[PDB]
Design a binder for these strands. Sequence first.
DNA 1: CGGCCTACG
DNA 2: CGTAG
DNA 3: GCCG
Length: 326
Amino acid sequence: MPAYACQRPTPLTHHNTGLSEALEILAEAAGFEGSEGRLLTFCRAASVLKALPSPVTTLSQLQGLPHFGEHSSRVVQELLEHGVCEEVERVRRSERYQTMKLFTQIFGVGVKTADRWYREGLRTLDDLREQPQKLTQQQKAGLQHHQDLSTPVLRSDVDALQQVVEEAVGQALPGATVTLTGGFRRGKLQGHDVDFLITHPKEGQEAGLLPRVMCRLQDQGLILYHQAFERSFCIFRLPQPGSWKAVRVDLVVAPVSQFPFALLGWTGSKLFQRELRRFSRKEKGLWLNSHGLFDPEQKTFFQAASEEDIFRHLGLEYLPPEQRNA
DNA sequence: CGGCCTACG
DNA sequence: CGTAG
DNA sequence: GCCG
Ligand SMILES: [Mn+2]
Ligand SMILES: [Mn+2]
Ligand SMILES: [Mn+2]
Ligand SMILES: [Mn+2]
Ligand SMILES: [Mn+2]
Ligand SMILES: [Mn+2]
Ligand code: NA
């Protein structure tokens, strides 16, 4: 079992859901306590289990696996022997975990903001609404649309959104293209949001494109919330039969020279991409982001035509999007 | 010991 | 700080 | 929490 998540296929459907979900509760809780390091280990351990070919049924089957030490192994052992891990159950039933989960699920609220509100005694979404001067415009919008934003986005919704985004993009710039990214490109059937990557085959034509797209969507009444720029984190008013629902949509523009890097980054998964960037720097001495792959000694950028080109330059076997579900 | 992804809004 | 994957 |  390779140690980096970008070195192994991780399918959407796997065989150790109960174990991985327990480890991911401890990872989320570690984040709520401000330990990115513990979060990362528990996330990595959970991800190792997603890549295994069969169910883990005995603790023996963990020996030698990367990112399993004393703590993650004891969690699995308790689950195998008893069906529950006391530590996991204490976290999941705790007021702190439940409230931090509630608050950080709001668009515009992260751990540091949620932790301050917790320390101030706040506990419910109505507590926040009762104190609106304490909110940014982004948080106001997240709270206003929280019910809709908690409803899974379905493929039906994606296809409708892709059509209205394609229409606005075509109106703003002939020849520009729209590519579905994020979890739906990895094969997920549901999501929290929809992610789109926009480019144009002639380098430089996409300059100024995203404000033009946003103006065109807003004039069609499709935008509930937004705000030169190249990433827009929007809330769309998606028509439904007789009505509408709020949906989170991310729109990203990249020049075509950067498109393989942006496609790779925005397709995820989040852990897959952090692991790939770590691998690139720590194992290959190259710096990776959604704009390019930089050799800091030659001070040159790798010219990629495809995602496959990037994997090859990093010495990695290519994984299609549906195997990046780390 | 000390790192843990690397950007944009 | 928030957002993204 | 795990590991280079
Ligand atoms: Mn026991
Ligand atoms: Mn997404
Ligand atoms: Mn840029
Ligand atoms: Mn230390
Ligand atoms: Mn994400
Ligand atoms: Mn520690
Ligand atoms: Na949030």
